[PDB]
Design a protein around this ligand. Structure first.
Ligand code: AGS
Ligand code: AGS
Ligand code: MG
Ligand code: MG
Lengths: 432, 432, 159
C-alpha cells in the first residue's frame, strides 16, 4: 500500500498532516519507493511545503540516479493518483505497515549481527557490531511513538477546547473541598506546586496527607522523599489512611491482626491507585534519575505515576550546573525548571515544599519575599501555599493557610483558611 | 520546465512583477520555446499587458514560420494552465533554470571561440572577440542572479525608499491608535521587540492581546509558549475575541450554541489570519528547533507566520553555549540575538517578554537597569515596553506602560501612557 | 557461570531460595547442563528439599539414558562446591546471563519463524507460530529481569 501512502501524502493535506515524522525511507523498499520518498523528503526539507506533481517531475529531471530507477520513479509518479478514503482506516493501515516494516528491518539486522557473531574470529568483521546490538535495536523498533502533535490553533481547534471547558479534564480534584473551590477545578497535570511552612511546621505531614488523598482517588502516586526515609513516610501514610495513630505504631497499642484486617478491607476497594515511595541521598537526585526511574517502573513494575511528589526539591541536583558552582539561588531555580519540565513532559502533578528564611521564622505572617533559597523558583512555581503554625494556632491543633502565589485565579479570593492538622494522625482536614 | 515558466508568466500575474527583466530569448531553447517567447515578448512590447491564449494563437497564426515550427508552437500554446504552485519554489526553480541556461550558452560561446581560435587568421572572423575576452563574459555569465545582494544603493534607489516612506513601509499596525502613534507605522518586520514586566503583572495578557489584534488584522500569528499553553493562553484568546470572561468559561455559562455561533461567525470574516499556539518544554526549544517548527508549520499546514510571540524568554536554551552562563549574560544575549536574526531572516514581527529583577518587584517605577535577565538583552532589543501594576492601577484595572529602547521613534513625550487592561477578558483597552 | 550457578544451587540455600522460579531448563545449555539441571528440578519437585550430591547421583543412575551423554551428565556433577562468594554479585551475574539466554532464544525462534515465512506457504509447518507472533516474544524477551524491588509501596508491603 506504499503507493497509497505516497498518494495520500501528496494529494491529501490531512493525511500528510497526520504522520510525517514517522515516515522514513527505510520503511518502504530497496528500490523505487525508497528513492521517491527520498526525493519527496528532500523537497520537504528544501522548500518546507507539499510538492506538486509538477514539482515532483521537476525534481525528477534534476536527478542523479541512472535510467532504470529513473523510469521506475516516472511510472510511480504516473501511478500517483488521488483516491477517496476515510480519515481513520488509512491511519490504522499506515501504522500497521510501519510497525510491520520496522520489525522486519530490526529482525533482518538481528540475523546479520547473529551471523557475524557466529563466524570464527578471523572470518567475522567489526562492520557488524557484536550481539550487544541485538537487544538495543529490538527495543528501538518498539519505541516508535506513532503519535505526534503540532500545536493548538485557536480557531481550528475549538471543538476539543469546548470539550475541555465543559469537561475540565486534566485538572485532578483534591479530597478536600476548600482546595478544589479555591483552585476551581482541582489540580492540573503539568503543574508544580509548593508549600512554605518552615522547620517542623507541618510540611511532611501535609505532603503525605495529600499523597494519601490522591491515592484514595484511584491514582498512581509517586512520593519521592529525600529528607525523609520511605519507611518513615510509609508509617505516616499508615497513620493517615489506617487512621490509628503514629504514637501507637511504636509501642504497638494495636494488634497485627486488626492492622492486617483493615489492610485487607482497604485492599478490596478498587477506588485506590498505586503509590510507591522512593528515597535518595541529599543533592544526589536529578531529573534524569527520575526519568530513568519512571522508565524502569513502566518496564518492570509496569507503573506510571501521575501525582509525583518531591520532598524539599531544594536538596536535589540540577544535573546541568557543575557541583555547587554558584549559590543556592541558581541551582534551586534550575532544579525547579527541570522538574517542572519533566512534569509537563509526563503530565504528572508535581508537589514540593520550600524553606522559609529565618527572618519569617516564628512569625504570624509569611510573604513571598520570605522565601529562603531563591526567587526564580517562585516565578517557576504554580499555586504556592503558605502554612503558618502559631502557639495559639498549634494549641488549636490547626494551621493557617494563605495564598502567596496563585495561578488558577485570584489570590485574594479566600486568603486565610485553616487546616485541622493532626500531628498524631498525620492528616489535615477542612474546618467545615 | 519551460512549459511551467511559460504557463506561470501567462497565468500568474504575481509571477510577472518579481522577475520579468531576467527573461532572454537565448535562455529558452533552440526549439519552439524561444519562438513562443519571442511571440509573447513581442505582444508585451506592442501592448504592455499579458496576452491571452487566444491572443497567443492569434500571434502564432499572425507570424509566419515553417510548417514544422508552426506545429511545434501550436503544441506549446496548447499546454498552459493556472496550476498554482508555490511562489518561492517557482522563483527558485526559475532561478536555477536560468543559471543552468546561462552556463550552457557560456559553454557554447567558449567552445565556439576556442574552435575559431586555432584556425589561421584568414579563416578568422572579425566578429568573434579575441580569446582574452572570456572572463568578463564568464563574469557576466556568473553575475546572473535575481536578488539585490549588492544591497541598498543610496542616491540611486531613492525612488523605492521614497515610496516606502510614502504611506507605510514594511510594518504591521498594532490595531491600537496609540501604539501605532508611538511607532508612527506600527512595528517593523524582522525587528526584535520585548515587553518586560513583573511576575504576574501584565505579561501573558499583553501577549494574548497583541496576538488577538494581529490575528484580527489578518496576519499569521505563532504563539510559542514555555508556560502552560495550548489551553491556557487559548482561553485568554477566547476571552479577548469571544468576549467571554474566563470565569464564565470555567463555570460553563456558555451553552456551546453561542460559542459555535461566534466561532463560525469569525470563520465567516475574511479579515482573520491564522494563529497556531505551540507549547514546548522549559529549556529545550532552541532557535534551531524554532526554524524546524516554522518548516513544519509551512509543511503540514498552509501556514507561514507573520508575527511570533515568546513567553518569559531566556528559555530557548541556545546551543551556542553549552553551560549556563554565570549571570546568564552570554546565553541570554545570544538568545536575543538569535531571535532577532531569525526574525530578520523571516522578515517577521517577533515579540517576547523579559524578566524584572527582585529590586523592582514592588517599585512603582522600573528603570532599564531593573532587568532580571542579562544587560545585553536590552541592547539587541528594538522596542522594549514595560508595564507596572500597582494597587492603585489594580483598583483602576489599568497599568502604567512605559516605553524604552525606542528604536522606532523617540523615547520621550509618550512614555506616560496608560491602558485599560481587562483582567476578565484578557485584553488592552486604550482610552480614547 | 553454569558451574557456579549449579554449585550454589546445590550448596547455597539462600541462593536457591532467592530466585528458584527464575530458572528454566532452557536457561542453561543444550547439553549436559540441561540434563543436570533437569535432575535438579526433578529432585526439587519429587522432594521439597535440597538434594545432596549422592541424591542426584542416585537420580541420574536410576533415571538414565543413552551412554553417549551419560558420561557427560555423570562427569558434570563432579565439580560443584561450597565456594563462598558474594550473593549479590551471584544474582546480578545470573540475571545478566539469563537475560542473554532469553535474548538468544527469542532471537532463534524469530529466525525460525521468518525462515518458515521465507518458504512456500504450502511447504510450511502449521504448528510453528506465525510471523505475527514475532513481536510479542520480543517483548517477552525484554520483560525478563530480576525484581530489584526498588522503592516501597504503602499497600502491598504491609507484610
Ligand atoms: N516523629 C514525630 N513525633 C511527634 N510528632 C511529630 C513527629 N513528626 C512530626 N510530628 C508533628 O507533626 C508536625 C508535622 O511534621 P512533618 O510535616 O511530618 O515534618 P516536617 O515539618 O516536614 O519536618 P522538617 O524536619 O521540618 S523537613 C510536626 O510539626 C509535629 O507537630
Ligand atoms: N484569566 C485571568 N484572570 C484574571 N487576571 C488574569 C488572568 N490572566 C492573566 N491575568 C493577570 O495578568 C497577569 C498574568 O501574569 P503575567 O503578567 O503574564 O506573568 P506570568 O507570565 O504568569 O509570570 P511568571 O513569572 O512566568 S509565573 C497578572 O497580572 C494576572 O493577574
Ligand atoms: Mg518534610
Ligand atoms: Mg506567563
Amino acid at each position: 500500500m506504499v503507493e497509497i501512502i505516497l498518494s495520500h501524502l501528496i494529494f491529501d493535506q490531512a493525511y500528510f498532516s497526520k504522520v510525517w515524522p514517522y515516515m522514513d525511507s527505510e520503511y518502504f523498499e530497496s528500490g523505487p519507493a525508497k528513492n521517491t520518498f527520498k526525493l519527496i523528503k528532500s523537497h520537504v526539507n528544501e522548500y518546507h511545503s507539499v510538492p506538486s506533481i509538477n514539482a515532483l517531475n521537476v525534481a525528477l529531471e534534476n536527478s542523479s540516479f541512472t535510467e532504470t530507477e529513473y523510469s521506475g520513479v516516472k511510472t510511480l509518479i504516473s501511478k500517483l493518483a488521488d483516491s477517496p478514503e476515510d480519515h481513520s482506516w488509512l491511519v490504522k493501515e499506515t501504522e500497521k505497515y510501519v510497525q510491520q516494516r520496522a520489525m522486519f528491518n530490526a529482525t533482518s539486522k538481528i540475523i546479520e549481527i547473529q551471523t557475524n557473531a557466529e563466524l570464527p574470529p578471523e572470518k567475522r568483521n567489526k562492520k557488524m557490531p557484536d550481539v550487544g546490538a541485538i537487544p538495543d535495536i529490538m527495543r528501538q523498533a518498539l519505541s516508535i511513538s506513532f503519535d505526534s502533535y503540532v500545536g493548538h490553533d485557536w480557531m481550528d481547534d475549538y471543538e476539543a477546547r469546548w470539550l475541555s471547558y465543559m469537561n475540565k479534564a486534566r485538572k485532578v480534584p483534591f479530597k478536600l473541598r476548600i482546595l478544589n473551590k479555591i483552585t476551581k477545578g482541582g489540580a492540573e497535570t503539568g503543574t508544580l506546586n509548593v508549600l512554605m511552612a518552615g522547620v517542623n511546621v507541618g510540611k511532611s505531614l501535609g505532603l503525605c496527607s495529600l499523597a494519601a488523598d490522591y491515592l484514595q482517588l484511584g491514582h498512581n502516586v509517586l512520593y519521592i522523599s529525600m529528607e525523609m526515609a520511605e519507611e518513615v513516610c510509609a508509617k505516616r501514610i499508615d497513620a493517615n489512611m489506617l487512621d490509628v495513630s503514629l504514637d501507637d505504631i511504636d509501642d504497638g497499642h494495636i494488634s497485627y491482626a486488626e492492622y492486617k484486617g483493615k489492610m485487607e478491607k482497604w485492599r478490596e476497594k478498587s477506588t485506590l491507585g498505586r503509590l510507591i515511595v522512593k528515597q535518595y541521598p541529599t543533592g544526589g537526585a536529578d531529573a534524569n534519575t527520575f526519568r530513568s526511574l519512571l522508565n524502569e517502573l513502566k518496564l518492570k513494575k509496569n507503573f506510571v505515576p501521575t501525582i509525583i511528589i518531591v520532598d524539599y526539591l531544594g536538596i536535589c541536583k540540577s544535573c546541568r550546573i557543575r557541583v555547587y558552582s554558584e549559590n543556592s539561588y541558581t541551582t534551586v531555580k534550575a532544579i525547579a525548571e527541570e522538574l517542572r519540565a519533566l512534569a509537563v513532559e509526563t503530565e504528572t502533578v508535581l508537589w514540593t515544599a520550600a524553606q522559609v528564611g529565618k527572618q519569617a521564622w516564628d512569625s504570624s505572617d509569611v510573604n513571598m519575599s520570605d522565601i529562603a533559597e531563591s526567587a526564580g523558583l517562585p516565578a517557576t512555581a504554580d499555586f504556592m501555599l503558605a502554612v503558618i503554625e502559631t502557639e495559639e494556632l498549634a494549641a488549636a491543633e490547626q494551621q493557617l493557610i494563605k495564598q502567596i502565589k496563585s495561578r488558577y485565579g485570584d489570590k485574594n479570593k479566600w486568603n486565610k483558611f485553616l487546616m485541622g492538622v493532626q500531628k498524631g494522625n498525620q492528616k489535615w482536614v477542612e474546618i467545615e
